[PDB]
Amino acid sequence: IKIMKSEVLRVTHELQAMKDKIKENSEKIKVNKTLPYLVSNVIELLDVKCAVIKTSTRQTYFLPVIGLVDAEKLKPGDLVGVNKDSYLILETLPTEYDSRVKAME
Amino acid sequence: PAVDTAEQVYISSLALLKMLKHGRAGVPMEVMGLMLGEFVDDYTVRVIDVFAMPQSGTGVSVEAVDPVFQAKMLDMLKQTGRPEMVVGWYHSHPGFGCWL
Structure with a gap:
């Protein structure tokens, strides 16, 4: 019966603080x-x-950390939006096709 | 009235060391922080301590001065023994020299 009061109070408090x-x-x-x-x-x-x-500015940088995305959900060749100066990956980008490629269809 | 060319801003050794440390940590991007000191008189402003502002996407701007962070840092530093006021701000300028 103690677990009701003690645990519910503590767990809701941690829930709100962590939230x-x-x-x-x-x-x-x-x-x-x-x-x-x-x-x-x-x-x-x-x-x-x-x-x-390798940035779109034709220069390749090594990243000590991946950034804000998951390394598992990545591979060679994926399009990622890195920071302008920190060059750190901020989010992954969907497969982008050039206008010429779309006109090719 | 007006200010004179003899005005001397006094930067303590600790303040300069902290500013240089934050600048060398910030590069290649630009960091910023609030200067703690005293306007002792009209012909000189004295800075004694400086603290770093956490990096933000805005850059070095008015929005980079986090109100809650600045308030908390000032409140906690006042308890320690540094009840100074904000005499100004500093920001690193990587590569290009000191200008505005």
Whole structure:
């Protein structure tokens, strides 16, 4: 009968504290994700979790960390929007086809 | 009235070390922080301590000065023994020299 009061109170308190702390962390991540998103490709994926990114500016940078996405859901050749200057992957991008390729159909 | 060319901003060694550390950590991007000190008189402003503002997507702007973070940092530093006021702000300028 003690588990009712003790556990319900403690667990709801941790739920609320973790919930508003998650909202704070997500807000910080969202505001930190500056939209420009310099488009880049992952030329290879290697273990230390680390990636070698060739940006659309024709220069390849090694990334000590993957970034804000999951390394498992990545492979060579995927389009990722990295930071303009930090060059860190901010989100993955869907398969993009050039206008010439679409006109080719 | 007007200000004079003899105005001297005093940067303590700790403040300069912290600013250089934050600048060298920030690169290639630009970081910012609020300067803590005192406007002791009209011909000089003295800064004693400086604290780093967490990096934001806005960059170095008015929106980069997080209100809640600044309030909390000032409140916690006042307890420690640094009840200084914000005399200004600093931001790193990688590559290009010191201008605005």
